[PDB]
Design a protein around this ligand. Structure first.
Ligand SMILES: [Zn+2]
Ligand SMILES: [Zn+2]
Ligand SMILES: [Zn+2]
Lengths: 195, 320, 286, 184, 102, 166
RNA sequence: AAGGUAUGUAUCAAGCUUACAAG
């Protein structure tokens, strides 16, 4: 599992083994696992999802369109932190060192400060889940020969190869055919005028 | 003598009883009202049009797409339908005025499928570039871009219970998303050829996916390979499922196969004709949707035609 | 691109007050390495001291376990290449603008989103420590870091401010000895300072001092501890554990292995939690 | 093959295992990784690679390659172990007659007769697939007249419309004639 | 933690992103609001609707001329409303390509 | 991203059509090792469209029947789009909604194609469907003209001599 | 207003940028 999963937070990569592409046995009416959750469970996951994307879109429009007159904050909230690195005679008695953190005012006469113009290429994606198809077949050397394509014998190409062999010049039936080439009633007209 | 040979339930066969011949362009996606009165379609005629579901007449043809219309759906909670097509545009056709009111924007390529969350008012859309997006209706603001695929994302459905969003893509994989965090929960690598249709059931769990190899069938928490279905071996486009377990798979060569949900028993195997102008090799199904009654199965095909099917009231076409 | 909640900040940069008041921006300056907009914080360490805002982002501090403004080690109070040579591994990072630079910072941020607790690769070799670095880890730090830098107009004698010039005066700096890995000017002098300590003189003979007066055994060292610390050196010729003075006598056959014991134990061999007692033995038939 | 072309063996193995867990169904990765460990020691690592390769249920080409591996290290025990799990998945007649192999290498007397029992009771109970009892007659004719009269002539309820084609029944007769006690 | 340009990284308050239609119409009670869908029959109602809509559609002047009668107008009658979709042969393209070109 | 305004309508239809036929042949061909020599089905598609506009038959020999009939359904799709835009903004430049010169000079070309291919369809259906005039229906006209001309005593025109006066 | 008097390279300052981390 740790080879297929590498680093991920115990996701559902467990498909890496064979035993879960075989068809699961036949279910008939087994309501506890087969049926959906009830209306109360789907309503509570509705409410969790709705308030999550609601605070997401509220912070979004209070950042995408935040232009209108909000208060700053009330940053009186202190923060106590035990400096758990050095303290023996560093600031002799600095056992827990509580600090006051305020938030600096932003003047509303400033342009954007930082050049948001950077482009790096897209990073490494999620490392690949295993693939687990059916056993891949190969057809023949004859039906694979059936699934091949002739080259292009165009009249304008402006592409890879204009491709002149000796044959493949007419490139049609005869470039024209009319299946009898004449209806015979012409005769039954023509001599009818001639006489 | 086969495993699960005796126990499929007998479903009656379906037959045509009208075709509807109106578009000038491939009719491409069908939706139908929550209130059963009329249904709606897009095209490559760049014109949505709605039709009386009873008499088949044309109520109105409303237009505004610069290019073809790959998807159209009509909302249940709100009185307006949504549309999406290859003009990169996703629109909110208000129905009380027959005009566009929201006109969503941000997809970097063509737009293939769209679906409405059935409980809260968001909208999940899938494109050609690689991504799917969570549009917030009322703000027309992209909540998430679901960036995890490597090719075109052919279809998307979404539901109320977890997992929320299911994107089947043209890089042969399904994946199942978190609507909240945006990250994918679980990707489903099967299907040597690409998945182009998923559908959910809507009584119990267990959705099902569609692909040229081996239409499969899954199970919602974690994803679990329940079953694969039989050899409907065209490059299939649509899956639709009725509340009494019948399931129609519509494909690109005209053939559409009826099934059942329970066993997997291929039932009817119906292949329809083309209407006079079309050549023989132009039959293919792009949409299929049941009625709210689920007495009518109506398919939008490449022959610029909506074909409307119904049941058959006999008994002696019995199961083998 | 980056928000924060509280900075990293080694102890000499906080100042001598346990009660300090500190202010924050939301996207302050940029990082002085990767140009990333962190949240700059500012405070007053002490009443005679400059403000010393915040220099690099939280990401570029979590990479090398470095404090936030003076760019020293968070575990020791030492420069960067002192730590990386003293741990013999560099944990590479590019130099150019994009060439793998913001790419690797972006991706190492993406794989640091889970913990937020420890550095990304130093965690495995920050345990096997405290031998070669602990001899130079200057506790009770000097606060001359925090003093305000030297003003002009006292350099030119012009400073009309008189006493209330906040910066400094009468500290002319010298233009002979003043980035992130290498090379840094005082660090070469400090590694020369550690390579050139004050030992005992090496007496003029041919390696006869295979015996040594090591003692201070007390109740900590036992016989098998010291002879298995010397068995990795090599073979004895005669051990004793003389407990009237709490001492131990070991030698080597052909001195060389015990030679590094003389290098290991110039008041320096620290096992069992004690500064051991070491002076020179006889090797003189006395 | 770049990492294996050089002396970095640990890294080549350390990417072969992620290649075969990422892409199971492609045969070449399993083949080259087994082959690499064959060129190294034949450690239970190599057998573990092989049994992982068995676990995905491959075709014949791989399975009797693994029994060929067990034969080229001369395993009575282990080629017995890994070849009963074979036959459940491939019931090929070419493989039914080659589960009849402990005869033609070890002669396995009573339990080889049990292998013939296992051959005779399974599929084609009245239809035989026209081939099992040819090779069973070849071994039991290579054996004495213990119970060789039964299967071609007197267990003959299980015919295929003539019990055999014309190609072999006179050959059945002269097959039974001249390899016995030959009583006057 | 540092999203794309729409979130915080840009002040480009573009038009078309301006708070238009900022409240949602819900489908009220006289339409097909989902409370009036949670019980409705849909099958008998559709059936009676189509059973109601199906029954809605319920001499001595020119005897020297040569062609004394063509005897037929179109040779049966002219009412088709047929639909060829091969677009060069459709009757819309026939009437287009006889109205404009001449 | 950028919308599809009126100057890149035609340069977006080709883009999405060949994306659709690309990941239709990508999901239609079976497990052979090469797909299309990396591009060749698309070359057959564009050649099929050029032969459609020029009314040349495009009978390429030796092509697999799924790809040849998917090329037929895609070029019928594009021909529907092309002629249904030709009808539309021909009527617009008839009543005068637009004055666009690109549109006028383009819809003269997108309609000369249509006339000339309808005309070779009707010249081709003159030959296989016989003369549209009957034998009696033409002998009647001929007899009527010789009666008219001999009642007029119309002396027929001689071929002009080389020494003709006027 | 654009749609025409091309753009693409190689050396040479002010414009703008922090006035910082520092034995
Ligand atoms: Zn930084
Ligand atoms: Zn510091
Ligand atoms: Zn001064």
């Amino acid at each position: 599992d740790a080879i297929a999963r590498q680093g991920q937070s115990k996701d559902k990569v467990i498909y890496s083994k064979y035993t879960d592409l075989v068809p699961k046995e036949v279910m008939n009416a087994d309501d506890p696992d087969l049926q959906r959750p009830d209306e109360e469970a789907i309503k509570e996951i509705t409410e969790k999802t709705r308030v999550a994307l609601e605070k997401s879109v509220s912070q979004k429009v209070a950042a995408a369109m935040p232009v209108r007159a909000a208060d700053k904050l009330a940053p009186a909230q202190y923060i106590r932190y035990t400096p758990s690195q050095q303290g023996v005679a560093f600031n002799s008695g600095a056992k827990q060192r509580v600090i006051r953190m305020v938030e600096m005012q932003k003047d509303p006469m400033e342009p954007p400060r930082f050049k948001i113009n950077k482009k790096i290429p897209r990073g490494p994606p999620s490392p690949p889940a295993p693939v687990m198809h059916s056993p891949s077949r190969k057809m023949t050397v004859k039906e694979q020969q059936e699934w091949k394509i002739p080259p292009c014998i165009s009249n304008w190409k402006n592409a890879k190869g204009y491709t002149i062999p000796l044959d493949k010049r007419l490139a049609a039936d005869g470039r024209g055919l009319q299946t009898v080439h004449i209806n015979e009633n012409f005769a039954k007209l023509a001599e009818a005028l001639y006489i | 003598k086969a495993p699960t040979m005796p126990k499929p339930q007998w479903h009656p066969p379906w037959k045509l009883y009208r075709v509807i011949s109106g578009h000038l362009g491939w009719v491409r996606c069908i939706a139908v009202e929550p209130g059963n009165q009329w249904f709606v379609t897009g095209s490559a005629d760049r014109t949505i049009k709605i039709w009386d579901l009873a008499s088949g007449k044309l109520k109105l043809s409303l237009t505004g797409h610069i290019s073809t219309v790959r998807g159209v759906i009509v909302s249940t909670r709100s009185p307006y339908l949504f549309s999406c097509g290859e003009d990169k545009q996703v629109k909110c056709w208000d129905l009380e005025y027959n005009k566009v009111i929201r006109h969503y924007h941000g997809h970097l390529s063509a737009v293939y499928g769209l679906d409405l969350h059935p409980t809260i008012d968001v909208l999940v859309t899938c494109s050609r570039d690689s991504t799917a997006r969570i549009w917030d209706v009322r703000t027309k603001a992209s909540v998430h871009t679901l960036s995890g695929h490597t090719n075109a994302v052919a279809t998307v459905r979404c539901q109320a219970a977890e997992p929320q969003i299911i994107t089947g893509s043209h890089d042969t994989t399904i994946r199942l998303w978190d609507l909240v965090a945006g990250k994918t929960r679980v990707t489903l690598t099967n299907h040597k050829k690409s998945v182009r249709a998923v559908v959910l059931h809507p009584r119990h769990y267990t959705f099902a996916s569609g692909s040229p190899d081996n239409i499969k069938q899954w199970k919602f928490p974690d994803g679990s390979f329940i079953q694969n279905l039989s050899g409907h071996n065209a490059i299939i486009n649509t899956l639709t499922v009725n509340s009494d377990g019948v399931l129609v798979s519509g494909a690109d060569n005209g053939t559409m196969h009826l099934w059942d949900w329970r066993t997997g028993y291929n039932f009817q195997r119906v292949h329809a004709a083309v209407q006079p102008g079309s050549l023989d090799s132009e039959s293919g199904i792009f949409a299929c949707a049941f009625d709210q009654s689920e007495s009518r199965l109506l398919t939008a095909e490449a022959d610029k035609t909506i074909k409307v099917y119904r049941e058959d009231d006999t008994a002696t076409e019995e199961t083998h | 691109w980056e928000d924060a909640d509280f900075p990293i900040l080694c102890q000499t940069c906080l100042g001598e007050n346990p009660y300090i008041r500190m202010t924050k921006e939301k996207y302050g300056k940029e990082c002085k390495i990767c140009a990333r907009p962190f949240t700059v914080f500012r405070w007053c360490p002490g009443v005679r001291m400059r403000f010393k805002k915040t220099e690099v982002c939280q990401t570029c501090s979590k990479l090398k376990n470095v404090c936030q403004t003076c760019l020293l080690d968070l575990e020791y109070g030492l420069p960067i290449q002192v730590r990386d040579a003293g741990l013999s591994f560099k944990d590479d990072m590019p130099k150019s603008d994009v060439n793998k630079e913001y790419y690797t910072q972006n991706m190492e941020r993406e794989i640091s989103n889970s913990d937020g607790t420890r550095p990304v690769g130093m965690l495995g070799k920050a345990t096997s420590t405290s031998d070669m670095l602990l001899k130079l880890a200057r506790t009770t730090p000097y606060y001359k870091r925090n003093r305000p830098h030297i003003c002009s107009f006292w350099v030119k004698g012009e400073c009309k401010r008189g006493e209330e010039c906040p910066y400094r005066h009468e500290k002319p700096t010298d233009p002979d000895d003043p980035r992130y890995y290498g090379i840094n000017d005082p660090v070469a002098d400090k590694l020369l300072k550690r390579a050139s300590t004050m030992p005992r003189l090496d007496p003029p003979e041919d390696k006869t001092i295979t015996t040594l007066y090591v003692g201070g055994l007390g109740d900590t060292i036992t016989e098998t501890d010291l002879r298995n610390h010397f068995y990795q050196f090599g073979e004895i010729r005669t051990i004793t554990v003389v407990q009237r003075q709490q001492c131990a006598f070991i030698q080597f056959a052909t001195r060389q292995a015990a030679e590094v014991a003389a290098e290991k134990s110039f008041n320096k061999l620290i096992v069992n939690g004690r500064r051991l007692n070491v002076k020179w033995g006889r090797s003189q038939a006395a | 093959e770049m990492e294996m072309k050089n002396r970095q063996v640990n890294h080549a193995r350390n990417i072969w295992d992620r290649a075969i867990t990422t892409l199971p169904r492609v045969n070449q990765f399993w083949y080259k990784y087994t082959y690499m460990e064959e060129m190294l020691g034949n450690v239970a690592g190599a057998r573990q690679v092989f049994e992982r390769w068995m676990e995905w249920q491959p075709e014949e080409q791989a399975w009797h390659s693994y029994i060929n591996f067990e034969l080229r290290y001369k395993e009575v025990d282990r080629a017995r172990t890994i070849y009963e799990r074979f036959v459940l998945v491939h019931p090929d007649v070419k493989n039914w007659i080659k589960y009849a192999r402990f005869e033609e290498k070890h002669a396995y007397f009573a339990h080889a007769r049990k292998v013939y029992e296992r051959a005779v009771e399974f599929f084609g109970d009245e239809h035989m697939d026209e081939h099992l009892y040819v090779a069973f007659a070849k071994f039991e004719e290579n054996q004495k007249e213990f119970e060789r009269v039964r299967v071609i002539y007197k267990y003959a309820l299980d015919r295929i419309s003539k019990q055999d084609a014309q190609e072999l029944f006179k050959n059945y007769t002269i097959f039974e004639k001249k390899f016995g006690d030959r009583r006057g | 933690k540092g999203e794309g340009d729409l979130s915080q990284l840009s002040k480009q308050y573009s038009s078309r992103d301006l708070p238009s239609h900022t409240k949602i119409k819900y489908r009220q009670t006289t339409q097909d609001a989902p409370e009036e869908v949670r019980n409705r029959d849909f099958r008998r109602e559709l059936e009676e609707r189509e059973r109601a809509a199906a029954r809605e559609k319920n001499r001595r002047w020119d005897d020297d001329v040569v062609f004394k009668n063509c005897a037929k107008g179109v040779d049966d009658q002219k009412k088709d409303k047929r639909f060829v979709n091969d677009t060069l042969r459709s009757e819309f393209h026939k009437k287009f390509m006889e109205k404009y070109i001449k | 991203a950028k919308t599809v305004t009126k100057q890149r309508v035609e340069s977006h239809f080709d883009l999405e059509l060949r994306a659709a036929v690309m990941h239709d042949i990508l999901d239609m061909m079976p497990e052979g090792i090469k797909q299309n020599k990396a591009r060749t089905i698309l070359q057959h598609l564009s050649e099929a469209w050029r032969c459609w506009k020029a009314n040349i038959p495009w009978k390429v020999p030796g092509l697999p029947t799924p790809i040849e009939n998917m090329i037929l359904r895609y070029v019928k799709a594009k021909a529907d789009w092309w002629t249904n835009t030709a009808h539309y903004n021909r009527e617009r430049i008839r009543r005068g909604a637009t004055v666009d010169k690109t549109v006028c000079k383009k819809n003269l070309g997108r309609l000369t194609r249509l006339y000339l291919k309808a005309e070779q369809e009707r010249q081709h259906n003159y030959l296989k469907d016989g003369p549209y005039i009957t034998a009696e229906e033409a002998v009647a006209v001929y007899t009527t003209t010789v009666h008219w001309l001999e009642s007029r005593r119309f002396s027929p025109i001689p071929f002009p001599p080389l020494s003709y006066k006027h």
